[PDB]
Specification:
This is part of a larger assembly, with two copies of chain A.
Chain A (H helix, E strand, L loop, with lengths): L5 E13 L2 E13 L8
Antiparallel strand pairs in A: 1-2
C-alpha cells in the first residue's frame, strides 16, 4: 500500500459467553508496516 | 662511524614502526568493536 510493505493477520480470542458457560470466539484484524530503518510498527 | 650507524639503524626502526602504526589506523578488529556499539544502540525504535 503506497510502496510500503504491510502485513495483515487475523487473530481469534477465546471468550466465554453465558446462557452455565460456553466458549465463544472473537476475531480481530491486525495491521503493521515496516519503517525506514527496517523496524516494524 | 659504527656507533652512529647503529644509532641510525635504531631510529630507522622506530620511524618504520610508528609510521606503520600511523598509516595503519583502525584495524579489522577495532572496526568490529565500534560497529557492535553502533548496533547495540540502534534498538531504541524496536524495543519501544
Amino acid at each position: 500500500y503506497k510502496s510500503r510493505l504491510y502485513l495483515l493477520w487475523l487473530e481469534q480470542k477465546e471468550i466465554t459467553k453465558q446462557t452455565q458457560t460456553e466458549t465463544d470466539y472473537r476475531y480481530e484484524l491486525k495491521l503493521a508496516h515496516i519503517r525506514y530503518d527496517g523496524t516494524w510498527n | 662511524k659504527t656507533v652512529l650507524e647503529k644509532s641510525k639503524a635504531g631510529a630507522q626502526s622506530r620511524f618504520d614502526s610508528y609510521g606503520k602504526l600511523y598509516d595503519e589506523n583502525i584495524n579489522a578488529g577495532e572496526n568490529q568493536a565500534m560497529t557492535l556499539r553502533a548496533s547495540a544502540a540502534g534498538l531504541t525504535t524496536a524495543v519501544q
